[PDB]
Every structure is written in structure tokens, then in C-alpha cells.
Design a protein around this ligand. Structure first.
Ligand SMILES: *CCC(=O)Nc1cc(Nc2ncc(C(=O)OC(C)C)c(-c3cn(C)c4ccccc34)n2)c(OC)cc1N(C)CCN(C)C
Ligand SMILES: *CCC(=O)Nc1cc(Nc2ncc(C(=O)OC(C)C)c(-c3cn(C)c4ccccc34)n2)c(OC)cc1N(C)CCN(C)C
Lengths: 279, 278
């Protein structure tokens, strides 16, 4: 059962903004849980029922949870409902690879790939479809430990549902499976597609997929059989997995469970699968 | 609207290097169509950026403004070269260092008017410079200065109000707080930079936050510390700069207000700037 802890607005403080958009504002804050004497660094999101949906989804997958998925800590009931979450202090992986591009060994890159798969596999075990997997939404607790984040679009599938039919826009395209782009169908297999783009982002140390290409042409370009180029550091074995994730046939794409295994093999001998200058 | 002139590379030669770095190399040059002194930028991703810089310079060329360096055209060769007008006296950052002791307040405040006039034209043209600084203001005559270096400039779409960066590299000590924290950029973020630039002119070319590393500036600013009042500045002048450095972007002066204010001060230079020898 989904069980949301309600926090009092006197329990926690916003220290500073981390990011903002029309998705709302995310602050770093500190939280003293009532009846404890310690400060907990936390992230706080505020802007309406979308936020409650988000909270519900996060709490549905809380038990028994996974170390590679961000946990909801609770919610607060002000004018606007606020999401209180764990804080990943090193920021998103997108920005981390761009900033430390020249220090990132092959061990770390394949390690992140495994964790992301581990996290998404758990989500799938819990019948959750994320719908917004990307490197911007993989956050760094420590360089050695990353976590999937941003459940704003995430959906839970019922017992006899295999897909989710979406209604409307507000979806990032260059990360979307073709059948999501054309039919607004989303499944575990569509999240696999996104996982491919994500690994791509990591392997290019944070290049913008389909750069310069307008979003209006992507379904066209993908239908014609164009995909993201092989990253320089990637042996052909690595780039093959990515390519599998972008197959037209959803069921032909790898399953997160396989991805865990495959990347675990590679991470067990990283210099054999990625060629990075300085390893 | 925007037009790009392509010029015959064989019509000119690089006479000497004016300066260079990781941004590429600028030379003095001479264009002989069929003699015009010119300045020439080339480099060693980077190739796309120099075309972006050309596009942006071309996008604001008509009608242009006297206080904005115009793109004359591009040359093709192995790599794209940007041909600009040449400012024969160099950047203002240097000029106020090398003439510390012989600058009428009339000149100093005039330059602040012209800088603002150029920035306001850019703003009308929906361009955010992103790199305003004393180094990026060049002197054509003592009476004529121009904004330069569109290496980072960005245009806004008809219903965009801000530009969101990909991080990269940026001059932190000239940047608005919302640019350091959230890497947002607006005309009002340029107003911050203008503040710092005027600061550098008033201090005859001092290094802003000289000594502090760049990693610690956003803290100083968050706390509410700013650059010190310069010796030659009355309080009216310093108040102007300080308004540029306000946390609330929409509470900074607009370039149109800076033109008005500094023109007023220019009409009576000694009242606003105390300079020994005037
Ligand atoms: C890529 C930008 C980024 O993520 N930047 C960033 C992020 C964070 N930490 C953090 N920790 C948790 C959460 C989270 O799960 O928030 C829930 C929704 C309340 C977030 C976060 C989630 N979303 C959707 C965000 C959007 C924008 C910004 C953050 C989030 N973020 C920190 O913690 C210190 C810093 C940080 N930095 C410093 C900004 C850019 N650097 C990467 C350079
Ligand atoms: C402070 C450095 C400086 O600007 N020095 C300098 C500048 C110039 N003239 C000049 N004229 C035009 C341009 C220009 O618009 O170049 C475009 C991008 C092609 C430039 C110039 C532009 N950038 C970005 C530069 C970077 C470094 C150097 C110059 C530019 N510069 C001249 O022409 C006389 C001389 C000059 N001096 C010789 C260098 C130092 N003295 C001022 C002390």
C-alpha cells in the first residue's frame, strides 16, 4: 500500500534553488524529522494534482525499494503540495559527465550503466513505466552511486495492462521510442529505448542526441532507420546493445534484466569494452 | 534580412597577431578589393561556433549601430575567417591602463553612454551578448568606442525571454547571479556585466574581485557583497552600478535608462567624477 508521511512545514527549510522551469522549482533543503535531533539534506519540489500523482507513484515503489531509485521522504501541505525527496548532492549525471569528462574512467561509465539498469529493472518488477529516463534524470549520490529520479511522468500498470496510453503533450522526443512518438504507447520496452539514449549520453560525455535536428523530423529520421552514431570510446559490442534498444520491434529490444547482466560482464573488464585515453 | 558577405581571401593578408588563445586568433589585416584596415578571427564544434558568431553579427547588422563592431564578411579558405572593422586603438581595458593619468571625466562618461547605446541596440535586436567587459569594448577614435566579441552572443525567439546555457566556459566575475547559479541569461544579465565594465573603466582597469577565486564569487554575491566604490566615483555614479547588481533582474536599470542617466552625468562631468587634473 502507498503510505505518504505528512511533514509539517516547520520540520524543514529551503536553503537554495537547484533548478527551476515550468515543471516547478526544486530546492535543496534540510529536514529535522519530528522527534529526532539531526538534520537531513533533502530536495524539495513545488509549483497541481500532478504532484500528488508523482508522490503516489514514488511511494508505491518505496517497499522494498532499490539503492538506485530516489526515495520519497514525504509530502507537505501548504498552499501548494510539496514533494520532499532524498537529495543527490553531486547533481545530475548529464552535468557530471560534461564537467568531469576528462577524469572519467571506463570503470565508472559501465558501473553507472549497470546501476541504471538495476534501478529500471526494480521499477519494472514494481510495474512502473518511467517515461522520462535520461542522463539529466540520473542523479549522483556519490561518484560510485547513482539513482533514477524524476517520476513526474511515471505510470503504474494494472495487473492485466501491458502498456499505458498517454493523453496530450509535455513529453521529450529525442528520448522517446518510435511507437511512443507515433501512438503515445509506453511500456517497459519504451523505457529500454530511453535507456539506450541515456547510455549514449554517458558514452559521449554528455553530447545532445540528434543535435541540430528539429524535434519535428525525429519520427521521420527514426522511421527511415537513422539512429545515434557509435560513440568514439565504445567498442562495437557496447554500441550493439544501444542499437538493440532502438529496434522498431519493442519485444526485440533487450530486457533491463539482460542489460544488467551484459553491462555487469563489461564492467567486470571495462578497458576491454571502452577505450578511454588515460585509463 | 540577415546577409552574409563572402569576401575573396586573395584580397587581403594577415599583417600581425593582435591576440589569441583558446577562442582562436585575431589578426590585424589589410583588405585590398581592387587599402582597408580590418581585423581577422580564425581558430584551430569550434568550426560551427565561428559560423554562429557570423550569423549573429549578420543578424544585427541592419541597420546596425555605431557602437557595435560590424561584420564586414567571411573568408572561406581551409577554415572560416571573420572579417570585422579594425579598432586602431585597441580595447578599453588596456586604454585606461595605459592612459590612467590623462582621461577627462567627459571621456569616461561618454564611453559609458556609448557602451549603453550599443547594448540597447543589441537588446532591441533581441541579442544577449553574454560577454560584456572592458576588454570587449574597443576604441576607434577617443570619441568612438564599440562593443565587440560576439563569440558567446545569442538571439532570442519572438516569445523567449531568456537563454539557458549548457554550462561550458563563461567569465564568472562579469556574470549576474542568476547566470552563475541557474545559467540563465537575459538582457538584464548583460546589465550586470555593464555594471562591472563601468567599474573597470572607473578604476582605470582593476581586476574585479582581485584575489578571490571564481568558485567563491556566487557566495559573496548571495551574502550581498559587491565590488567596492571606485575612488573617482561620486555616490550618484556608484549607485548606478549597484542597481545593476541587484538580485531582482527586473529591478536592474534597463540600458535605455543607463543611456539617460550617464548622458545626464556626461553633460556635467566634473560634478560626477572627481579627477585630479581636471
Ligand atoms: C541536471 C541538473 C541537476 O539535476 N542539478 C542538481 C541536482 C541536485 N540534486 C537533486 N537531488 C534530488 C532531486 C530530486 O529527486 O528532486 C525531487 C524531484 C524533489 C533533484 C532534482 C530533481 N529534479 C526534477 C530537478 C530539476 C532541477 C534540479 C534538480 C532536480 N536534484 C543538486 O543537489 C545539490 C544540485 C544540482 N546542481 C548543482 C545544479 C547543476 N549542477 C549539476 C552543475
Ligand atoms: C585588449 C586586447 C585588445 O582588444 N587589443 C587590441 C585590439 C585591436 N583592435 C581590434 N579590432 C577589432 C577586433 C575585432 O572586432 O576582432 C573580431 C573578433 C575579428 C579586435 C579583437 C577582437 N577580439 C576578440 C580580440 C581579442 C584579442 C585581441 C584583439 C581582438 N581587436 C588592436 O588593433 C590596433 C590592437 C590591440 N592591441 C595591439 C593589443 C594590446 N594593446 C591595446 C595594448
Amino acid at each position: 500500500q502507498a503510505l505518504l508521511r505528512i511533514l509539517k512545514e516547520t520540520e524543514f527549510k529551503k536553503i537554495k534553488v537547484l533548478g527551476s522551469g515550468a515543471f516547478g522549482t526544486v530546492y535543496k533543503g534540510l529536514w529535522i524529522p519530528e522527534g529526532e535531533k539531526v538534520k537531513i539534506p533533502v530536495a524539495i519540489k513545488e509549483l497541481n494534482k500532478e504532484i500528488l500523482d508523482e508522490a503516489y507513484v514514488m511511494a508505491s515503489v518505496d517497499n522494498p525499494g532499490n539503492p538506485h531509485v530516489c526515495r520519497l521522504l514525504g509530502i507537505c501541505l501548504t498552499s501548494t503540495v510539496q514533494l520532499i525527496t532524498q537529495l543527490m548532492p553531486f547533481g545530475c549525471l548529464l552535468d557530471y559527465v560534461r564537467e568531469h569528462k576528462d577524469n572519467i574512467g571506463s570503470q565508472y561509465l559501465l558501473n553507472w550503466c549497470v546501476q541504471i539498469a538495476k534501478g529500471m529493472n526494480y521499477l519494472e518488477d514494481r510495474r512502473l513505466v518511467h517515461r522520462d529516463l535520461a542522463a539529466r534524470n540520473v542523479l549522483v549520490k556519490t561518484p560510485q552511486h547513482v539513482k533514477i529520479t524524476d517520476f513526474g511522468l511515471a505510470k503504474l500498470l494494472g495487473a492485466e495492462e501491458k502498456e499505458y496510453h498517454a493523453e496530450g503533450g509535455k513529453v521529450p522526443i529525442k528520448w522517446m521510442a518510435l511507437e511512443s512518438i507515433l501512438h503515445r504507447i509506453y511500456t517497459h520496452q519504451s523505457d529500454v529505448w530511453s535507456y539506450g539514449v541515456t547510455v549514449w549520453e554517458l558514452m559521449t560525455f554528455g553530447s545532445k542526441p540528434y543535435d541540430g535536428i528539429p524535434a519535428s523530423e525525429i519520427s521521420s529520421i527514426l522511421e527511415k532507420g537513422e539512429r545515434l552514431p557509435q560513440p568514439p570510446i565504445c567498442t562495437i559490442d557496447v554500441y550493439m546493445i544501444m542499437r538493440k534498444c532502438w529496434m522498431i520491434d519493442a519485444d526485440s529490444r533487450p530486457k533491463f534484466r539482460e542489460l544488467i547482466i551484459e553491462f555487469s560482464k563489461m564492467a567486470r573488464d571495462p578497458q576491454r569494452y571502452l577505450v578511454i585515453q588515460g585509463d
